């Protein structure tokens, strides 16, 4: 879940006020302050917006794609600026940051 919250009480909803609730439990904790949105460009042309943290593993990222799109992780390979992404590494390992684009290609074995 994501929503705007008027933290500062300007009365004017601002860009630095998009908050992201990863757990979907109604709140943002200290860890979710670092949450971000990344984009995943698929082959159907559809672009998926993902809610992630820099500590998320690529395997987690793939699990989230399945929640949203129904695609099994075994069928998923992710690419970021050339480097294909290893399941056990994190978004931070690859220096994947807010509003980065990942490419989702089709995994074929052998």
Binding site for Gd ion (CB under 5 A): 6, 8, 10, 12, 14, 21, 23, 25, 27
For Gd ion, the closer CB: 8 or 74? 8
> Counting beta carbons within 10 angstroms of the beta carbon of residue 3, is it exposed (0 to 12), middle (13 to 18) or buried (19 or more)?
exposed
CA distance 20 to 4: 9
Minimum gap (Å) between residue 6 Cβ and Gd ion: 5
Minimum gap (Å) between residue 79 Cβ and Gd ion: 29
For Gd ion, the closer CB: 16 or 44? 16
For Gd ion, the closer CB: 14 or 86? 14
> Counting beta carbons within 10 angstroms of the beta carbon of residue 103, is it exposed (0 to 12), middle (13 to 18) or buried (19 or more)?
middle
Which single residue brings its beta carbon nearest to Gd ion?
10
CA distance 83 to 64: 20
């Amino acid at each position: 879940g994501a929503g705007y919250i008027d933290t500062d009480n300007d009365g004017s909803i601002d860009g630095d006020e998009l908050y992201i609730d990863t757990d979907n439990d109604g709140s943002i904790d200290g860890d979710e302050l670092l949450a971000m949105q990344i984009f995943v460009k698929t082959l159907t042309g559809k672009t998926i917006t993902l809610e992630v943290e820099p500590s998320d593993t690529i395997e987690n990222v793939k699990a989230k794609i399945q929640d949203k799109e129904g695609i099994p992780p075994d069928q998923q390979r992710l690419i970021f600026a050339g480097k294909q992404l290893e399941d056990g590494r994190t978004l931070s390992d690859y220096n994947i940051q807010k509003e980065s684009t990942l490419h989702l290609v089709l995994r074929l074995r052998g």
